[PDB]
Amino acid sequence: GNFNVAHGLAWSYYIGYLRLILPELQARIRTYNQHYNNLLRGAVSQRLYILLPLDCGVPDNLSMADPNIRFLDKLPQQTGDHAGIKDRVYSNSIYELLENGQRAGTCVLEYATPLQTLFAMSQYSQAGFSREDRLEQAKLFCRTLEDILADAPESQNNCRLIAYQESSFSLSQEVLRHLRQEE
Amino acid sequence: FNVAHGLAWSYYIGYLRLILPELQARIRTYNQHAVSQRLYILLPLDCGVPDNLSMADPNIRFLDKLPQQTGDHAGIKDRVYSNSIYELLENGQRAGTCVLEYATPLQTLFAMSQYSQAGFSREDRLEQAKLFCRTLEDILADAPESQNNCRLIAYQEPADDSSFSLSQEVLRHLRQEEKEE
Ligand SMILES: [NH3+]c1ncnc2c1ncn2[C@@H]1O[C@@H]2CO[P@@](=O)(S)O[C@H]3[C@@H](F)[C@H](n4cnc5c([NH3+])ncnc54)O[C@@H]3COP(=O)(O)O[C@H]2[C@H]1F
């Protein structure tokens, strides 16, 4: 039930996206740092940071969710032909993480989009899913994605999952704690 | 539920719900600079989805790309949605033009059945392929804003079948469409 739906979305997230952008992600980051970002303490991290809100609350604007998260730039976009669609675009955004009025981190940050589907299926009666099912599917989505990335050859320490519950919550502080943990 | 339910709702929530309300506006922009005003989505039940439509049928040739759609989605700013226009050849000459593409989650279902840690049989793939189409069809039936902007073409045909012409089937749907308008 709740397993098979989140199992398919996690594999969909990996087949259709992560396995395609992760092998060439660190080269895109290194190219951006060497040519467009000569800040000795402001280099873009070498990992794609995927936000996993366990309540599946995914806003369309990541910066307006926290005044300490500021859009900086975009990586060089990656294109390719997929399913008869010529030059399908894959673009990732670089963000500035502020703390105490200072630049504390720079990272490629985005949400796990399939969590929006779990929310919609919990919202629409035709999908026939309840809110408690959505919470269980979100946890099963994260766990399945962990099992895939732990065995995927495209994941060469270039992607970090950030799962969290749910305002006394700072999203930039959530990413900064994971950022500084690897530095 | 099962795998196809999430893939179908994702295809609607994450794609068709976003581009179909703006589809006819982009087609009018393309005419301002003879294509039907509906998105034609192929649903091969065998989940055989080639990245190049011409490899499935050489009579399907790439003509041009629609004006790109752009919007903020999830943490990705200015996510790009692009659609391609194709001409369909009949006896070496153009017989029709339309915005054509496969349903990508069907290709995802195929790749899922090939990965060991996915636990996805070949029989599971065909059943989820049918469940994907029925769920998508039922979703679009309750969303007329999106139903009249698209036409779904589900079909079951092996690659060993020289009796099937993908371009002729799309042309039949195109000609049957204009005959009802
Ligand atoms: N460029 C880019 N950026 C960020 N994230 C991505 C990404 N490409 C993939 N992903 C991630 O991987 C999931 C599965 O991708 P997939 O391809 S296997 O299935 C998709 C596809 F059939 C259709 N669709 C959505 N956008 C589409 C565009 N522009 N053109 C054609 N078809 C599209 O709708 C399904 C669900 O879209 P989703 O956003 O809810 O989930 C996506 C998303 F989370």
Question: Tell me, what amino acid is at B180?
Answer: E
Shared domain check, A109 and A26:
no
Across the interface, do B4 and A9 touch by the CB < 8 Å criterion?
no
Task: Tell whether the torsion through CA atoms of B47, A7, A182 and A44 is positive or negative.
Answer: positive
Q: Give chain B's length.
A: 181
A172 and A118 both lie in a single domain:
yes
Would you say A47 and A160 are in contact if contact means Cβ atoms under 8 Å apart?
Answer: yes
Count CA atoms closer than 13 A to A140's CA, side-chain side. 17
Query: Which residue's C-alpha comes closest to atom 5 of ligand 1?
Result: A17
B77 in A contact zone (CB under 8 Å):
yes
- Read off the DSSP letter of residue A77: P
| Token couple for B89 | 């050849």
A99 shares its domain with A40:
no
Report the residue from B7, B51, B86 with minimal CB separation from A12: B7
B17 and B41 housed in the same domain: no
Cβ-contact B42, B103 below 8 angstroms: yes
The per-residue DSSP string of chain B comes to --HHHHHHHHHIIIIIHHHGGGHHHHHHHHHT----SSEEEEEETT----SSHHHH-TTEEEEEEPPPEEEEETTEEEEEE--EEEEEEETTEEEEEEEEEE-HHHHHHHHHHH-GGGT--HHHHHHHHHHHHHHHHHHHHT-HHHHTTEEEEEE---TT-TT--HHHHHHHHHHHHHTT-
Instruction: List the strands of the sheet with A159-164, edge to edge.
Output: A69-74, A93-99, A102-111, A48-53, A159-164
Question: Is A91 in contact with B80 (Cβ distance < 8 A)?
Answer: yes
Is the distance from CB of B135 to CB of B154 less than 8 angstroms? no
Residues A35 and A89 in one domain: no
Domain boundaries, position B124: 36-181
Task: Give the Cα separation of B119 and B121 in Å (integer).
Answer: 7
Residue B111, chain A, CB below 8 Å: the answer is yes
Residues B22 and B44 grouped into a single domain: no
Residue A151 to residue B117, Cβ atoms within 8 A: yes
A162, A111: one domain? yes
Mark whether A155 and A183 lie in a shared domain: yes
Q: Which two tokens stand for residue A11?
A: 């594999």
Domain closes at, from A13, A28, A44: A44
Residues in chain A: 183
Choose among B72, B84, B108: nearest Cβ to A16: B108
B28 shares a domain with B113: no
- A160 in helix, strand or coil? strand
Residues 6 or more apart whose Cβ sits within 8 Å of residue B55: none
Instruction: Count CB-CB contacts under 10 A for residue B121.
Output: 11
Q: Which residues of A touch B111 (CB under 8 A)?
A: 15
Burial of B124 (0-12, 13-18, 19+ CB in 10 A): middle
**B8 and B43: one domain?**
no
SS (H, E, C) A27-39: HHHHHHHHHHCCC
- Cα gap B132→B108, rounded to integer Å: 11
Choose among A117, A86, A108, A116: nearest CA to A37: A108
> Is B148's Cβ below 8 Å from some Cβ in A?
no
Residue A16 and residue B104: Cβ atoms within 8 Å?
yes
| C-alpha span between A114 and B73 (Å, rounded) | 11
**Residue B83 sits in the same domain as residue B115:** yes
For chain B, the first-to-last Cα distance in angstroms comes to 39
**Angle at CA A22, nearest 5°, toward A84 and B9?**
50
A77 and A4 both lie in a single domain: no
**Closest among A98, A114, A117 to A106, alpha carbons compared:** A98
DSSP at A17: I
Report whether A172 contacts A97 (CB < 8 A).
yes
> What gap in Å lies between CA A48 and CA B77, rounded to an integer?
15
Q: CA–CA separation, A4 vs B4, rounded Å?
A: 9
- The answer for residues whose C-beta is within 8 angstroms of residue A146's C-beta and 6 or more apart is A161
Do residues A158 and A44 make contact, with C-beta atoms less than 8 angstroms apart? no
Q: What is the DSSP string of A88-138?
A: EEE--EEEEEEETTEEEEEEEEEE-THHHHHHHHHH-TTTT--HHHHHHHH
Among candidate residues A35, A163, A15, A172, the one with its CA nearest the CA of residue A82: A15
Rounded to whole angstroms, how far apart are CA atoms B112 and B122?
A: 10
Q: Which residue of B1, B3, B9 is in closest CB contact with A120?
A: B9
Looking at the DSSP assignment, which residues form a beta bridge with residue A53?
A164
How many domains is chain B built from?
2
> Apex CA A164: angle with CA A158 and CA A166, to 5°?
145
Backbone angles phi, psi at B179, to 5 degrees: -70, -15
